[PDB]
Amino acid sequence: KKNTALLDIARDIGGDEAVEVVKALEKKGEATDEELAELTGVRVNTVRKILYALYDAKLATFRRVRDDETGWYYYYWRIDTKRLPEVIRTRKLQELEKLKQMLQE
């Protein structure tokens, strides 16, 4: 039930690619952008844009590692269902009162 609801939010976010990304992420526990682009075949710019969307929806978190050859960070993402129930609800309420204002036209 939370399995499918997560994936449905992913579809709204980014279609079949988002659903591939979420599924590979859950199967792997944690993953980098690059690891997810290779697991899935989706491009890394799009894996990344999906992940930052899941992060803004507070459905994903990450933890950062400093790559010491270059000094730049790279993220290890993971799905965070902790607040998924409140997210599912908020999205319903919001969609409902988007309808409410069309009725108040």
Residue numbers in the entry: 5 to 109
Which lines from the publication concern this structure?
After screening derivatives of TFEα, we found that the 13 kDa fragment Pfu TFEα (TFEαΔZRD, 1–110 amino acid residues) was crystallized. The structure was solved by a single wavelength anomalous dispersion (SAD) at 3.2 Å and the resolution of the structure was improved to 2.6 Å with a native crystal. The TFEαΔZRD structure consists of the N-terminal eWHD (residues 5–86) and a long α-helix (α5) that connects the eWHD and the ZRD. The eWHD structure is similar with the X-ray crystal structures of the eWHD of Sso TFEα15 and the eWHD of human TFIIEα23.
For promoter-specific transcription, RNAP and general transcription factors (GTFs) are recruited to the promoter DNA to form the pre−initiation complex (PIC). In this study, we determined the X-ray structure of TFEα and the cryo-EM structures of three forms of archaeal RNAP, including the apo-form, RNAP–TFEα binary complex, and RNAP–TFEα–DNA ternary complex. The structures reveal that direct binding of TFEα can shift the clamp conformation from a closed conformation to an open conformation.
